[PDB]
Amino acid sequence: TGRQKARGAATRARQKQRASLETMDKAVQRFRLQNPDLDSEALLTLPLLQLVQKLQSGELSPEAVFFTYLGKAWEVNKGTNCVTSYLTDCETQLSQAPRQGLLYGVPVSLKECFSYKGHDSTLGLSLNEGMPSESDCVVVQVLKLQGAVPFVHTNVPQSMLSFDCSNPLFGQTMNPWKSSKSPGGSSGGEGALIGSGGSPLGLGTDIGGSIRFPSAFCGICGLKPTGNRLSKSGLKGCVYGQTAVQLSLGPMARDVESLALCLKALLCEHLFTLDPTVPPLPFREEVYRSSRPLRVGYYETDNYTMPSPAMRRALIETKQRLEAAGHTLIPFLPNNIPYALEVLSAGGLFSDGGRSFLQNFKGDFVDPCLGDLILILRLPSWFKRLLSLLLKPLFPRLAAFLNSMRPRSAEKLWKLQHEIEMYRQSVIAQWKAMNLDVLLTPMLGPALDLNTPGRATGAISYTVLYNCLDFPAGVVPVTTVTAEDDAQMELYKGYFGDIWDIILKKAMKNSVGLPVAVQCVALPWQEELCLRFMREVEQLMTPQ
Amino acid sequence: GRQKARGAATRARQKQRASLETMDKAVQRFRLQNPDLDSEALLTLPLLQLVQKLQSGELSPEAVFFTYLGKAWEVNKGTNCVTSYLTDCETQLSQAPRQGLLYGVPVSLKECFSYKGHDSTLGLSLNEGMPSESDCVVVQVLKLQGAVPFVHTNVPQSMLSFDCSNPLFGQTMNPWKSSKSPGGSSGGEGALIGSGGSPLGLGTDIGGSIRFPSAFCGICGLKPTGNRLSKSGLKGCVYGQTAVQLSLGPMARDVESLALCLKALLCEHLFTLDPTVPPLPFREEVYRSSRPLRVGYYETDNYTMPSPAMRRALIETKQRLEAAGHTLIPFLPNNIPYALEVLSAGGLFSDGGRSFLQNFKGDFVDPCLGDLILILRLPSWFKRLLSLLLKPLFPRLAAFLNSMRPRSAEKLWKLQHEIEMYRQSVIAQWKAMNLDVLLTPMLGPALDLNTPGRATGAISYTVLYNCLDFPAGVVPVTTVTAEDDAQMELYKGYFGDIWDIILKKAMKNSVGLPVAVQCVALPWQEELCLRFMREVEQLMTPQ
Numbered sequence A: 001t002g003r004q005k006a007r008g009a010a011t012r013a014r015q016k017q018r019a020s021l022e023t024m025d026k027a028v029q030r031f032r033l034q035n036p037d038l039d040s041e042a043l044l045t046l047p048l049l050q051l052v053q054k055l056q057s058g059e060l061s062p063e064a065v066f067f068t069y070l071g072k073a074w075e076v077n078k079g080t081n082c083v084t085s086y087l088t089d090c091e092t093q094l095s096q097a098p099r100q101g102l103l104y105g106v107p108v109s110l111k112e113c114f115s116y117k118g119h120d121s122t123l124g125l126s127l128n129e130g131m132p133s134e135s136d137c138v139v140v141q142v143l144k145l146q147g148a149v150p151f152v153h154t155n156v157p158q159s160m161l162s163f164d165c166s167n168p169l170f171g172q173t174m175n176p177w178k179s180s181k182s183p184g185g186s187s188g189g190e191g192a193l194i195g196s197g198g199s200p201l202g203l204g205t206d207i208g209g210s211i212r213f214p215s216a217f218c219g220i221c222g223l224k225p226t227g228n229r230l231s232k233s234g235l236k237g238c239v240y241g242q243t244a245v246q247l248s249l250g251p252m253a254r255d256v257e258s259l260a261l262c263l264k265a266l267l268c269e270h271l272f273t274l275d276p277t278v279p280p281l282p283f284r285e286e287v288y289r290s291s292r293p294l295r296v297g298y299y300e301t302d303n304y305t306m307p308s309p310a311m312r313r314a315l316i317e318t319k320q321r322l323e324a325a326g327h328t329l330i331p332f333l334p335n336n337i338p339y340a341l342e343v344l345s346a347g348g349l350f351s352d353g354g355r356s357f358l359q360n361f362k363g364d365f366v367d368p369c370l371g372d373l374i375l376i377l378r379l380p381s382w383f384k385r386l387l388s389l390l391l392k393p394l395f396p397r398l399a400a401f402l403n404s405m406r407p408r409s410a411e412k413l414w415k416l417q418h419e420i421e422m423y424r425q426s427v428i429a430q431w432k433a434m435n436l437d438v439l440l441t442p443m444l445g446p447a448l449d450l451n452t453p454g455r456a457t458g459a460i461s462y463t464v465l466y467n468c469l470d471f472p473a474g475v476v477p478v479t480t481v482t483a484e485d486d487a488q489m490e491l492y493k494g495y496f497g498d499i500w501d502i503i504l505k506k507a508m509k510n511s512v513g514l515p516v517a518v519q520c521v522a523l524p525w526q527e528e529l530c531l532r533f534m535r536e537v538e539q540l541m542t543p544q
Numbered sequence B: 001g002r003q004k005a006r007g008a009a010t011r012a013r014q015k016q017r018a019s020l021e022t023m024d025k026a027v028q029r030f031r032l033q034n035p036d037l038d039s040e041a042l043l044t045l046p047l048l049q050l051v052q053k054l055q056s057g058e059l060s061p062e063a064v065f066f067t068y069l070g071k072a073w074e075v076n077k078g079t080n081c082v083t084s085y086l087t088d089c090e091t092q093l094s095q096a097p098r099q100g101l102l103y104g105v106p107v108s109l110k111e112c113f114s115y116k117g118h119d120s121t122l123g124l125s126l127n128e129g130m131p132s133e134s135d136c137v138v139v140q141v142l143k144l145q146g147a148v149p150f151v152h153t154n155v156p157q158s159m160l161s162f163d164c165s166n167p168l169f170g171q172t173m174n175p176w177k178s179s180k181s182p183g184g185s186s187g188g189e190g191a192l193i194g195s196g197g198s199p200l201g202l203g204t205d206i207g208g209s210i211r212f213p214s215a216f217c218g219i220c221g222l223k224p225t226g227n228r229l230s231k232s233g234l235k236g237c238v239y240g241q242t243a244v245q246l247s248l249g250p251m252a253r254d255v256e257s258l259a260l261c262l263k264a265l266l267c268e269h270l271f272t273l274d275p276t277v278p279p280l281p282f283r284e285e286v287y288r289s290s291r292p293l294r295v296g297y298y299e300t301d302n303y304t305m306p307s308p309a310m311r312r313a314l315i316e317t318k319q320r321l322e323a324a325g326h327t328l329i330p331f332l333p334n335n336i337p338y339a340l341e342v343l344s345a346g347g348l349f350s351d352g353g354r355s356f357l358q359n360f361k362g363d364f365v366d367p368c369l370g371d372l373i374l375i376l377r378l379p380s381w382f383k384r385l386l387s388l389l390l391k392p393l394f395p396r397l398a399a400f401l402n403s404m405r406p407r408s409a410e411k412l413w414k415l416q417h418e419i420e421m422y423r424q425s426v427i428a429q430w431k432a433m434n435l436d437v438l439l440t441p442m443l444g445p446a447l448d449l450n451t452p453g454r455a456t457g458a459i460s461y462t463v464l465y466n467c468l469d470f471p472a473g474v475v476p477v478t479t480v481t482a483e484d485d486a487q488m489e490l491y492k493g494y495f496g497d498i499w500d501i502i503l504k505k506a507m508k509n510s511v512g513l514p515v516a517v518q519c520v521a522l523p524w525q526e527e528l529c530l531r532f533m534r535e536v537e538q539l540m541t542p543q
């Protein structure tokens, strides 16, 4: 535990970030000089579908779209620190973008863990600094074959096991709505950047909420597909081979139609031939565009994380609008939530007591946004056990988590994997007994204060459940925190009254004006229906 | 502590006996009322023409059902393939959806497909008297398509075996030759279908278990990608093991029957009964394509020396495919020994066999399992020491033994990641040669009863494709000639270990037995695997 390697890694990373920003700015200046007459705010505020259509007609050139968004990104980065790297070869890709690509001319931002040839994917960890990828990951190759132009890497919290957004290399990303707030994570850089208008489309990943937290905290749309709907080939992570709780990747954008367009672009022959392990399910457009009324299961609370007044209102309003539009709304709650989170989800993420994950931290600083996670994982199994016994009568949530963070044998992992498998069937059976099409749930919100997500773990209950179940789940911004909702946080107690409830209460205060989302869920492989429902919520709640 | 196990065998034996009595009484009544039915003509109809006549009304479902029931009862006399008669099937028979793609087709089920009110014992006494509360998903889908599941077929005890005997229902025999294994673990299906007792069956395959019995018994079989079909309600020994992928699929007399079965199963009913299965419908245009293929092939995997019959089968098919206009490209997946001894074995036994062993507490161990149970029971440190001792002389045994030790969750994660990088590695190696499909030997001809369990090395041709989770199927293409049999005198093996020695003896005295090749396509590519299989069948067995 000396820190000289970690300091040198930060110095190099900060230099590279600084020089990327300088290059971006030079390129933007050069462009703006050659084109002082371009209506840049008209271009930036076009919805993606309309941007794509003008690109396709020739009305906007790719260059103008690209450098206009580049300047916007450089500008919003000043207040958010969301961009870790400029993807330097993107000006060449711009000139070779295939004219028939579904995303021809579209600049796209990429969460830092998407391998991009020539660039680190540090995950904010010093051991990955100075080790550039030697190829584009598969989805990046597909984006490029669809004529998209990936142009920046966006920040993530250290090792990505977090829903905040700071690391010791690139520092802290900020919510563009309010700089005291987290932009969510681990796809926080994408949320910050997309939520301020600096990118029309990005890709994130999500193993416990990491597409959905930043999309909700920053006021944009996001979808986490079924884990094996899209290729994971070439994604950087901290731990490999953990398959109990399913990692997924997916789009973040300003509206639902953008998510659909991106999935449609990715789910093409190129993807399925580049990674044959992905079932070749094309995008089922007729499901996405369907207009039939739905049977919509819903819940207003999971009884685990007390929803904020603004979350609860967002959900009840959406429900009511969905009723009025003719959908049938049916109360529904997945069975045994506390078991799913405390045993299955926590147990699957940390089946080896965190040993693999800890290896990444050897000799490194631990970013304060992770709170006491590293400290606690380092405890020897017997002491976790003892502490878990001692906390059980006082703080049972904490005790259950702690016990599930213990290493175990492969025999016990199989047993866990089999329980995950039975649990997924138990929820599908509830769903089919009620004959649901989709499921409406609250989504954690408004944005928590910086540095509190790592100290409020129970609050992952709304999202992580669908990584456990491996169901597609998306979020759509539906309202903003009113002063009335905010004042009502003084009455919030949580269901448990433990440290997690106490932190969450304080962290959600001061949020007037912040966006608040609901989550839309469908069955495995039903991304298009999930999106069809999202589009409906978006239309109903935010018609204009 | 075997008294409970004895009781379980007595009860299972009485259920099997009653089942067979029930079947015979129903068959005799039917034959009496239909003395003129041409029962040979019906039994010899390819499944596709049988389906056609059922769909038109030309044959009634009753006629087809009782004729197969009678044939199943008779071939069972010589094979012991049937464990149970699925009693309510006569009622299913009457309500069978007239529009289903399988309307009126009798279908046999390996015993591990749960059927309401029936045990799936897997030959184990702890599962006797534990009847299932409902039909598993694929059985529900088969009935919704108008098929009539009618028997459960035998499997080796626990199913972790490619022979076919257990202490409840006893031993299943190859129908071509009664001293030969029918293969397994889907051996009851191989014996039943390979003798004309059933036109379509479902088996399961974690290391070759659809492919061994189809090859040994001279029928076709397809192991799809592991998650192409629903595994919901399948009975198993060990649950939660997901490194090496279990797959389920059809067995039948011809390729077209496999394709018709896959196409019936891949329908909205399956996709909504089990939403965890990607809803990929059967792509008929892929299956019916007639474009020339780039076909990779090997004659040996350099791990298990092929029998002369296997080698000849492989070369002959290769030559035919060349003469029909396909490009044949030497190709051998890289690092097979690692895939077998480290990935496959470690994947199947990551816990040192602890969970598997719990099924055997208090039970007999069928002889067809060999010393598997004895070896898994050894302390980890002892497995390690023997491994170290065996290594300079017998590296295969040593590597397997080492991989059957219990390991930690952390190490299983590392194994799971190695399996996934190995899979990307072979896929990369396949695309660099621009292969459409791959042709390989398939183990055969059938081994002597009670030798599969002592010749584990012989799993190398099949389990590789469970490890990689590629669709793979088998097609009978030739029969052993007196020349192929005599050349077994010269059989050496690459290792000269005890597995080479057992296998050499086990494959002799086989003149006249069927021998297959194996066809492989990339993941999710069942329709192309089948097109390729249909081509092999058409070129090698034209009439």
Ligand SMILES: C[C@H](C(=O)O)c1ccc2c(c1)[nH]c1ccc(Cl)cc12
Pocket (backbone or CB within 6 Å): A161, A345, A346, A349, A371, A372, A373, A376, A398, A401, A454, A455, A456, A457
């Ligand atoms: C007690 C400690 C804390 O809340 O400070 C703690 C306990 C559990 C977790 C954590 C931090 N940070 C986490 C992140 C993910 C998961 Cl699954 C569990 C935890």
Ligand SMILES: C[C@H](C(=O)O)c1ccc2c(c1)[nH]c1ccc(Cl)cc12
Pocket (backbone or CB within 6 Å): B160, B344, B345, B348, B370, B371, B372, B375, B400, B453, B454, B455, B456
């Ligand atoms: C030593 C003993 C034998 O050769 O009979 C043995 C050793 C390994 C295995 C086996 C039997 N039976 C098996 C079945 C599957 C696997 Cl992966 C390994 C084995």
Ligand SMILES: *C(=O)NC1CCCCC1
Pocket (backbone or CB within 6 Å): A160, A161, A162, A163, A185, A186, A205, A206, A207, A208, A209, A210, A211, A349, A460, A464
């Ligand atoms: C992204 O999915 N972030 C997750 C937050 C909860 C624990 C795992 C990581």
Ligand SMILES: *C(=O)NC1CCCCC1
Pocket (backbone or CB within 6 Å): B159, B160, B161, B162, B184, B185, B204, B205, B206, B207, B208, B209, B210, B348, B459, B463
């Ligand atoms: C069927 O898949 N049987 C397998 C044979 C080899 C050992 C695993 C079980």
Ligand SMILES: [Cl-]
Pocket (backbone or CB within 6 Å): A228, A279, B227, B278
């Ligand atoms: Cl899958």
